C-alpha cells in the first residue's frame, strides 16, 4: 500500500486550496476501506479534517465543517480535498491516510508543506 499527495505548495489569503491524494495497492471498492485527511501546524498537534467512505458516505469535522468538500474518482484512484478561505492559521502540513475501523490511520503518505501568506 502506498499514498502520495500533490497540489499547490503556495497560496494567498482568502483563497481556495486544493490537494490530490493518489493511492496504490488498494481501492475504494472493498468494504471498510475509507480515506481521510489530517493536518499538523508546525510544532503543534495533528488534527482531523474530513473523511470519505467506500460507500460514498462523507463526513467532516464538526468545528470546521461546511467547507473542505472532499470528492473522489475511483477510476484513477484519486481523492481530492478543497478548502476555501485561506487564513494564516491554515499554514500546516497535510497527510492523507487510509482508515480501517480498528486500525485507525494505519497507512500515511508523505505530506506536503504549504504556506498561507502574502
Amino acid at each position: 500500500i502506498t499514498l502520495k499527495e500533490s497540489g499547490p505548495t503556495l497560496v494567498k489569503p482568502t483563497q481556495t486550496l486544493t490537494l490530490t491524494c493518489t493511492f496504490s495497492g488498494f481501492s475504494l471498492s472493498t468494504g471498510g476501506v475509507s480515506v481521510g485527511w489530517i493536518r499538523q501546524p508546525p510544532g503543534k498537534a495533528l488534527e482531523w479534517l474530513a473523511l470519505i467512505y467506500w460507500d460514498d458516505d462523507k463526513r467532516y469535522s464538526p468545528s470546521l465543517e461546511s467547507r473542505l468538500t472532499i470528492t473522489k474518482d475511483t477510476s484513477k484512484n484519486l481523492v481530492v480535498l478543497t478548502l476555501t478561505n485561506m487564513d494564516p492559521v491554515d499554514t500546516a502540513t497535510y497527510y492523507c491516510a487510509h482508515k480501517t475501523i480498528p486500525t485507525i490511520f494505519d497507512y500515511w503518505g508523505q505530506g506536503t508543506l504549504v504556506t498561507v501568506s502574502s
Binding site: 497527510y95 480498528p102 486500525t103 485507525i104 490511520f105 508523505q110
Partner: peptide, 25 residues
Amino acid sequence: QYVSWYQQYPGKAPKLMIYEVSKRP
C-alpha cells in the same frame, strides 16, 4: 475501546505502533 498510538520522528510521517489497546500490528 479503539485507541491508537503513533510514533512521530523529527520531521517524518507518523508510524502506527499499536492499535486496539493491547493489540499490535
